[model samples]
Target: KVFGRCELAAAMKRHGLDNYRGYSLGNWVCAAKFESNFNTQATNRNTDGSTDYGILQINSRWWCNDGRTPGSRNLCNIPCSALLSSDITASVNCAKKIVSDGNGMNAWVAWRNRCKGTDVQAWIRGCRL
Candidate 1:
């Protein structure tokens, strides 16, 4: 129920936002809120019925399927819980890599640009915990 704020902060740090301010936490939390209500255990089946898993709600069928299991994917197999358990900065870093490799930070920047209608700094103010 806590939603892993500390873990989230750490996840941000791993992506090179080591000096993370509270507002930045808020923005990431806001994205998690929008994505999966910050539930690390959340999972959903896509319209085509493939499963998405974990806090960022990554599509396991798409991202995690090729390496190990070919039929079904599990969060336990991926380092998701380990990353979340260690920190959110780690978890989010993993997600960003899966989503855009090293460009995940750019995805966040782009998200801020598209949704907040302001610069990243201003958007951070509105997004803080």
Candidate 2:
């Protein structure tokens, strides 16, 4: 089955990723798995009591203007269609920017490595994209 676009777009944006021109659909799927398990309607609350909402688990109250509503079509504010549209290259590039820009992908890599083995620090030090 095909993956959801809205979810993928949000994942990319969440990580500040870009440069997805060379990425495969499988890679996109993998990123979705890494980010929020592909649940488009997921939400989480920060320790400060503000909420992060939607598929990418975006902190709408913080980074976006979606008004804390999950799955609302506030595309003007959060651009949900950018996630669902068929612009694969743009979507992938956006996601890459999110992941590589911060400690985002590093943290994901660490989590994945730790799941595979106990030596998280060693794995983190040696891991490469």
Candidate 3:
């Protein structure tokens, strides 16, 4: 499923991403826009042979297990497929872990390259709640 901008914001807020660890919902919103365009089924293969899955583009190498990434840690202990679903609960949960695990939003380069240190509010400008 592909989410509209505010729809994705609302969904992330619903999953407790607002001000998560000092990262505002707009950061998450902007990351989602650049990373996967809010598409649940998005996937990008990395040069190291790891695959990024779902909206936030969680990596198979350290976060989720796709059963193919060598030395997979499966830190989220979930199938990579879980991140590709429209529910987003699993994605947000894993994202929380990623942030708390010292990676912060930098876990996704998309966040660092675009969302970080930017006026992220515009990503959710028209969104209420």
lDDT of 3 by residue, 14-84 (tens): 98999999989999999989999999999999999999999999999899989899987899999999999
Question: Sort by lDDT, best first: what order?
Answer: 3, 1, 2
lDDT by residue (19-91, candidate 1, tens digit) is 3332344455455555566676666666665655556556555454424335655433454344334244445
| Candidate of highest lDDT | 3
lDDT of 2 by residue, 1-129 (tens): 133544454445344442344433334445454454665444566665555444344443334443444443332244433433434333344344454544544334423443323332221232222
Better of 2 and 3 by lDDT: 3
Candidate 1's TM-score reads: 0.50
- The clash count of every prediction, one per candidate, is 9, 16, 0
RMSD of 2: 9.2
Worst 10 residues of 1 by lDDT: 120-129
Which of candidates 2 and 3 reaches a greater TM-score? 3
Q: Quote each prediction's TM-score.
A: 0.50, 0.39, 0.97
Off by over 4 Å in 3: none
